[PDB]
Amino acid sequence: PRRAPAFPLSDIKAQMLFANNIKAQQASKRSFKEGAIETYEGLLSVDPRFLSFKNELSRYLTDHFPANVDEYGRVYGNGVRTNFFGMRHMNGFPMIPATWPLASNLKKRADADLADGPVSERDNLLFRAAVRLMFSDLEPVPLKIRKGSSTCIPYFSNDMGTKIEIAERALEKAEEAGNLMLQGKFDDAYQLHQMGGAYYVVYRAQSTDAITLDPKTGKFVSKDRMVADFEYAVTGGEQGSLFAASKDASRLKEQYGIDVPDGFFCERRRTAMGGPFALNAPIMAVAQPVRNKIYSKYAYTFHHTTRLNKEEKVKEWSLCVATDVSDHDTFWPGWLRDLICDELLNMGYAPWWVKLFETSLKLPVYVGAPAPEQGHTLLGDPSNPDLEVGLSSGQGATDLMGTLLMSITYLVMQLDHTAPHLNSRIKDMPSACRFLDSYWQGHEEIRQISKSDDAMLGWTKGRALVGGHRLFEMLKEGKVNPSPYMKISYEHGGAFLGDILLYDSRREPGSAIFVGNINSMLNNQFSPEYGVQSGVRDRSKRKRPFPGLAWASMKDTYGACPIYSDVLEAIERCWWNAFGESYRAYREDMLKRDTLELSRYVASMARQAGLAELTPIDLEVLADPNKLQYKWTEADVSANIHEVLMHGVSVEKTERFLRSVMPR
RNA sequence: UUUCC
Ligand SMILES: [Mn+2]
Secondary structure, eight states: OOOOOEEETTSHHHHTTSOSSHHHHHHHHOOOOOOOOEEETTEETTOHHHHHHHHHHHHHHHHHSOOOBOTTSOEETTOOOSOSGGGOEEEEEEOBSOOOOOSBOHHHHHHTTOOSSOSSHHHHHHHHHHHHHHSSSOOOOOOEEETTOOOOTTTOOOOHHHHHHHHHHHHHHHHHHHHHHHTTOHHHHHHHHOOOSOEEEEEEEEOOOOEEEOTTTOOEEEOOOEEEOHHHHHTTTSSSOEEEOBOBOTHHHHHHOOOOOTTOEEEEEEEEEEOOHHHHHHHHHHHHHHHHHHHHTTHHHHOOOSHHHHHHHHTTOSEEEEEEESSHHHHOOHHHHHHHHHHHHHHTOOHHHHHHHHHHTSOOEEEOOSSTTOOOEEESOTTSOOOBOSOOTTSTTHHHHHHHHHHHHHHHHHHHHHOGGGGGGOSSHHHHHHHHHHHHTTOSSEEEEEETTEEEEEEOSSHHHHHHHHHHHHHHHTSSOSOSSSOEEEOSSOEETTEEEEEOTTOOGGGOEEEEOHHHHHHHHHSOSSOOOTTOSOGGGSSSSOGGGHHHHHHHHHTTSTTHHHHHHHHHHHHHHHHSSOHHHHHHHHHHHHHHHHHHHOSSSOTTOOSTTOOHHHHHHHHOTTHHHHTOOGGGSOHHHHHHHEEEOOHHHHHHHHHHHSOO
8 A cells, every 4th residue: 555654743743743831842852762770779770780680590590490381382390481581681771773663554464364354254243243242231430540641642741630631521522523533524623622643652661572592602692573664664564674673782881881791682672652642531431331341241251360260260171272462463453443333333332432433543653762863753644544553552442452353363263173063153143142142151162261362262072172172283283374363373381361371291271270470470570661760759650659569469479380489599599699688688678668658548558557458469550550451450459459540530421421422 | 750551
């Protein structure tokens, strides 16, 4: 297709994305920035002692605890699935350059031999059925907003009062805005109600990424991460180039005088997108009720909490297949957006709301700073949104879009390769709805537990079982993609939402158990994705509000990992060698301090009652709110704790809004 | 804070 139009920041189309206030203006111009993070209060990620510690711990653990993953990617034994060199990154310093987001993924999908629409009428009915079951009998709830999160385009406000006003105003004018859009008046909808414009593209760190130690050379090698330059991004890959970013950290020495030990690299950086809040609010007001519905009625498939919660479902299976999806967000198909919108209209959803929804999935993107001297460019024209970026992480229902796509993708996979006998049950909408309603409740011989791009597919005893083994074998072979919709493979070291499925000698689900991933404990403790932001007075607004609290939930979260004790002892030993102090004592102090600080934020919490009323989930979330995005949901956290991290808009205002959106 | 869901 055509190249997407691009506008420099000086152009009026990009200028219009940033309000006439300092924050917005600074956000538009912010140049590439890097620097060591404050891993913990008073400790830099590049502190010589800390890097020495990481070098000793990483080698030691890898040495003594080699991965235990079989030929089918099932993990067993020590519950270790890879080496421990992932911790060897100079946290805060990114690979250069970060990628330019692809303005269109049509070609990327076509070239990967993925379909440009439902391949059969059956699939078409299943995707639409997914829409009818998910968006049908919704109950209004307060629109909850994350504290400290930015409203992005055009105001970039982080003020709760301002966010609540923006959100309330948005639920009030959404109808008018959507109708303007239905008339092709996007500039009007944006100018009047700030609904439109673009996603603000930021780069986030994936603090740990694969690193291997070459036996032959004795040198460490970081996994190459391919990035697209501007030409490639605007032409959907027809021109320009895709090349490996540089993770080499040598530069830190001459540039900053930072000492770079051997085998330490710059961090992998991923794109994140901040949505224009006025547009997302009306979307989030529907999205939450949808989540509430699927996590309740379809809890079997979609509601995952503890490792035992997962385990109970999986141990009833005769076969469990741990899938992997390649680059889910960028391959997400715009045809599914259009299918979902079309089906919502068929269900009687307000056209103006569906239009807001459709538009949220075609919005231009404003690229900030992928590298020194690059960026500050708007891709796509906000006057007529027509990008096909795949799925924007900042869209108000991103989790649901990925979940709807994949859940049906896996079911189709199970039907195609193992359960032809179930096809006669999917003949029209009613029967498709009935079958999907039953499958999602775990009532069929083929099952799944999934979230966005993570899942485990199951087969009980029955006719499909033999096909299930063939599918598994096909995946192991890795020669033929089992799906026409996304690039599916098997996970090397099967895990689901953070918990590794630990298999015994029988290599069967019934005798397998879910254990915490010890490598994630290390990632969270020694390679956080953000510094402690000690300059942000209000801790509820920080990326890591109460880092110390994770120590109190550690045993609960990682206690079942086979080498749990071993890792804690190796840490203690190496921290001793590097700092001359006890890591455990260090964490107990942090734990006490954050525990005291926390009572300042929790009203119900006695001005010093312990952590007695808090669950392990509560703790992990207070230390890392991001887990409330990729792992758990509001309902999994104690109510008094939830209020620490979120604030809501009146139920009355959303109720009125929701009534005007929904069919009946 | 220096920008996400
Ligand atoms: Mn998985």
